[PDB]
Design a protein around this nucleic acid. Structure first.
Ligand code: ZN
Lengths: 98, 149, 139, 129, 24
RNA sequence: UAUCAACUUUCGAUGGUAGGUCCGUCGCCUACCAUGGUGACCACGGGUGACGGGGAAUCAGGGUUCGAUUCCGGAGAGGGAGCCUGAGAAACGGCUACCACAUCCAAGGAAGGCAGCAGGCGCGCAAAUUACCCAUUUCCGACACGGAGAGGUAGUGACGAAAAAUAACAAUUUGGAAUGAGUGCAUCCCAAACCCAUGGGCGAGGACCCAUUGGAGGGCAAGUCUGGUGCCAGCAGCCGCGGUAAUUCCAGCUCCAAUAGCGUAUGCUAACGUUGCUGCAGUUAAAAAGCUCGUAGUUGGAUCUCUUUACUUUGAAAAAAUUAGAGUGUUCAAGGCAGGGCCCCCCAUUGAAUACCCCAGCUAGGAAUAAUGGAAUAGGACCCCGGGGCCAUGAUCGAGAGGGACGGCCGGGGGCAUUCGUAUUGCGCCGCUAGAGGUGAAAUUCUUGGACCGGCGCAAGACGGACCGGAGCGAAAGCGUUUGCCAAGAACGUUUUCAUUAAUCAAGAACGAAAGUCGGAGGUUCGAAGACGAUCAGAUACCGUCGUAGUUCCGACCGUAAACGAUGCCGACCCGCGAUCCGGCGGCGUUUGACCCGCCGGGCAGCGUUGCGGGAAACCACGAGUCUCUGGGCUCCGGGGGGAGUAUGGUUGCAAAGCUGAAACUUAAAGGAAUUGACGGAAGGGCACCACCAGGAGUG
RNA sequence: AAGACGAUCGAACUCGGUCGUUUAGAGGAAGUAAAAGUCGUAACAAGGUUUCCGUAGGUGAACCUGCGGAAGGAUCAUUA
């Protein structure tokens, strides 16, 4: 039976999209079917940002961040706990989790 | 829907219920004929004849003032060609497509469109033959059509 | 959808003509096959000579030795397996004698827990097997 | 692309009647459609329809009274005689008490009871009950 | 896997052609 | 029946001329000439358990099947061929041959055709008596007379059909009372006999003058009855019954649709709307060709007193029988076409009819629908008198169909050439050092021949990220770095132009991801194959190192994908809202088109209601709605699951294989959707010193 | 009258071509029905390497892998 109206991808009005590669498994995943995850984290951890702050030779220097664009396949986005298996009625919620 | 194209677009003319001529038009039945004559001899198709008259001289429907349309006027005088201008541009497009295919060989979309252009030519000529407006021996040949443009 | 046009009597007739062949019960009765492969050749009964007395084992989940006989037809020389219907009537079967076999219920289909036997013997030695089972026509 | 104007006419009436509408707009008009509505209006299934007299195919706005159950066409227009007219009555009408089959005899468009009284058959257009 | 039933079938048909080719 | 697509003639195939021939026409034949005739509207070829029809069976309607079979027509007399006679035969219950078969011979010869009536053999599942007679019915001749196995009658006959016993009236078991079936005489009947039918006579109380056939678990009306048989024997069309308390089987009783019939096998019909024209299905159960073009075929926008076709009505025709069916008490009925009553009249010189007979042709109306068609260089309609006059002098459009022009565009549409960005990999130099690669772990491998790592670099080949979205474009496959070149396309705009030029489409064709194939270049990375390293009981794998073909480009092939929206195209109708895409339109503003509020037209989609419908449900407004209230048009395609996309044939291809495509046989399920449990090596939450943390005892 | 030339119709026979149809065959290779015996675990829960399509190669065996797909996936969703 058809589990999702969009078949688990964002292909509407098209016949084929460019496949991209995953991150933790390097699997060819379509661009619209990829599990996008824009990771933006500091270069230094919050537990070690104070040691780098006092060692900074300047007065006020904002530590930059790691802007990483990750792609996950369905089999890995669930194993990595990026996405979960929701209820039959909960799958229709396209709102990003807070 | 379109003949050899998808989509069911609706963009055409709507003639109003007024089967008359607006009073603010000062061009008589003979003055408009001279405008069609002076421009058809200049190398302008009847499709281009009504455009310039509508947009510069303000013509609405020559079929109301005159008992005949632009086609039956130029043919009664002898200023319009034998083959209609609609089929003329159908052959002109195929010439550009053929010349495009002669340089670019692996353009499959241009070759696909070439069949559609010719398909409308044969369907139109099939209506031309049964209407006695074209000779029954008239046949579109892609080799000899280059000089017809 | 189906063509409903007033001049589509030929299109409708030829379509139904070629689609009836996709029916199993129609194609088996309107082709050379299923008639020449049929040992009876389109007959209800047939006579034959008892060649062997073979006991075929029933299929799962049943367990019982179905008593049949390997009979060779006289009309075309084909060898079939007629099932001895009643109980203990296999002993009433004589060796190398004439038996009038007939179909076994379903037409050309094995009946019950028997694997492939689709024939049953009606008469034995020019007399009915049912009488031999009910103490009549002592032969 | 149309292949029938009476089919799209009675299809618009049948849908608007079931949707509870009081008036239905029929985009194409024709003398066969107008005489078809007259047979229904004469028997009390539709109201007074107004023909929009345009210099084109023409439009018709029918006043629906809700008394109609369904109006449909029989495509193609089969040739119905008088000996087989009783057959079409059992296949298209709900019962022998009501419902009419619109035939096109040589005397014009009429129902099946009028064609039997006039003792003449013709081509069948549709039905209504 | 129905695809390997098609893989073994094309492999059996290809062998039947070689047996039928040597009987020419 | 296309796994028969082209066919017919170097001997007639089509037509033309003349002639021959025959009763007569004709390529019927001959001769001279033409290159014709038929064909996707299915010719030709093949098959038929094919004589055709009238009809039969079954059917609500529509249909399906059957028709050797007594009537009509045709065909044949073992297979052919050729003749005689006659008005009529290519006759065979007449000949002449050959072929097949076979009889009598004295061995020289002669004589044979039961698919006529009986009968025999054979064949088989399958089908009567070497019977009696020209009376009916009629037929043949010289005919009142004679002849008829044509026919009539009887025997055999459970093909089948119509009537109709095995009691009844009583009693609480015995009384008569009523009648044949059977059994024996006349008469009738019959050409004689025979079955009857009739008159009396002889004729039943366990009225023994006796009814069986499948059943009794369910479907499906009838017993947890009785006993043994114990997954054995068996029962069972299907599901299923037996592994020592069987409602199934092996038997009794009893009971049940029954019934002089009743089971079984097979064909066929309904059941079956599981062949669907009426009237089915193709999102997920079997299924819309990957996509588009395209002829034949099929169906085609609106517009005319409210030239010929198709269509409807009427009559003759549209054999009889049969059927429907008026009429008639064959004791009734199946049937028959014949008879109730008054002493030679009386159903008014007793009957008595009719319908149906499809289709086609024929006969007399109507003019709705759908075609067709009369005037555009008017050889125009009429009247004049080959010149004029005369007419309202002759062209409907402007599709909520389409083509094209044209304007501003728009878009990953396509071809080709350039620009750029790195990265991976390879190499050189500079700098420091011993491990590095990789893995869950390990090892292969690279390494003081400087690996890995850092910089400056260099070279080659792929790729074109993030922007990039449930956004666009294209018929689909598919398409996103810059710039340039090239010719297309939808939508929108339009009082432009053309004026039904259409839609869908067997046959045919373009294109068609990837892999593969042939021929070159280039081979970075990846990487079929392959080697090796690990793991395991075993890995010919996943993991790792390395790497051929391949992956990249160029041309010719291959035409296959879960080519999917698992959902054909066109058209109408049928809900709402907020967004989004292109174009157009009109409105406060902000900003030098951008943004804001709307609206009209298509495009991808979404949400809500489907509890205005649909569906098995999941779900469906790119309808999967307007479907028993069934018919808008068209194409393709499905008929339980397997066998099997196999065999074979044709065909395409270099090959791999593509298209087309079976059967035997096997099977009672396969499958779809949904639900409750269980389970997961899935996720989440929660709980207990038989968990840990913190320790404390003790075990080992 | 027998008989004979020639023409014509033409059975039939001896050889061939073609079509239809019916059958033998050493051997080879499948299908189905049995018992499910051996081997391994391919699939069904993340079936323990997600499944599956097309294609190709390889492998005792189910299968493995590459390339391009599809969700009938365990994702209808992942943030300026
Ligand atoms: Zn991935």
């Amino acid at each position: 039976t058809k589990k999702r109206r969009n078949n688990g991808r964002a292909k509407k009005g098209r016949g084929h999209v460019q496949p991209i590669r995953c991150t933790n498994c390097a699997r060819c995943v379509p661009k619209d079917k990829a599990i996008k995850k824009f990771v933006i984290r500091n270069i230094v951890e919050a537990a070690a940002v104070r040691d780098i702050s006092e060692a900074s030779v300047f007065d006020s220097y904002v530590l930059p961040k790691l802007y990483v664009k990750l792609h996950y396949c369905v089999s890995c986005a669930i194993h990595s706990k990026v996405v979960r298996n929701r209820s039959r009625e909960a799958r229709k919620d396209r709102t990003p989790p807070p | 829907g379109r003949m050899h194209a998808p989509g069911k677009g609706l963009s055409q003319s709507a003639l109003p219920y007024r089967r008359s001529v607006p009073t603010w038009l000062k061009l008589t039945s003979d003055d408009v004929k001279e405008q069609i004559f002076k421009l058809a001899k200049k190398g302008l198709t009847p499709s281009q004849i009504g455009v310039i008259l509508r947009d510069s001289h303000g013509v609405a429907q020559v079929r109301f003032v005159t008992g005949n349309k632009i086609l039956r006027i130029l043919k009664s005088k002898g200023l319009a060609p034998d083959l209609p201008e609609d089929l003329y541009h159908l052959i002109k497009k195929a010439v550009a497509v053929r010349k495009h295919l002669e340089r670019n060989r692996k353009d499959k979309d241009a070759k696909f469109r070439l069949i559609l252009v010719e398909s409308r030519i044969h369907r139109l000529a099939r209506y031309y033959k049964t209407r006695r407006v074209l000779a029954p021996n008239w046949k579109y040949e892609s080799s000899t059509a280059s000089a017809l443009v | 959808g189906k063509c409903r046009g007033l001049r589509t009597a030929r299109k409708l007739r030829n379509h139904r003509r070629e689609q009836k062949w996709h029916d199993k019960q129609y194609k088996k009765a309107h082709l050379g096959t299923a008639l020449k492969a049929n040992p009876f050749g389109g007959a209800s009964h047939a006579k034959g000579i008892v060649l062997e007395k073979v006991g075929v084992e029933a299929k799962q989940p049943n367990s019982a030795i179905r008593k049949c006989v390997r009979v060779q037809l006289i009309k075309n020389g084909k060898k079939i397996t007629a099932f001895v219907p009643n109980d203990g009537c296999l002993n009433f079967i004589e060796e190398n004698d004439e038996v009038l076999v007939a179909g076994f219920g379903r037409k050309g289909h094995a009946v019950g827990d028997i694997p492939g036997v689709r024939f049953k013997v009606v008469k034995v030695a020019n007399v009915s097997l049912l009488a031999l089972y009910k103490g009549k026509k002592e032969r | 692309v149309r292949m029938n104007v009476l089919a799209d006419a009675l299809k618009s009436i049948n849908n608007a009647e079931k949707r509870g509408k009081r008036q239905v707009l029929l985009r194409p008009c024709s003398k066969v459609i107008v005489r078809f509505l007259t047979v229904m209006m004469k028997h009390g299934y539709i109201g007074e329809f107004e023909i929009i007299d345009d210099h084109r195919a023409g439009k018709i706005v029918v006043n629906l009274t809700g008394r109609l159950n369904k109006c449909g066409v029989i495509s193609p227009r089969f040739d119905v005689q008088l000996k087989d007219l009783e057959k079409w009555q059992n296949n298209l009408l709900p019962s022998r008490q009501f419902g009419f089959i619109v035939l096109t005899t040589s005397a014009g468009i009429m129902d099946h009871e009028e064609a039997r009284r006039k003792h003449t058959g013709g081509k069948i257009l549709g039905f209504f009950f | 896997r129905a695809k390997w039933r098609k893989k073994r079938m094309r492999r059996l048909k290809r062998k039947r052609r070689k047996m039928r080719q040597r009987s020419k």
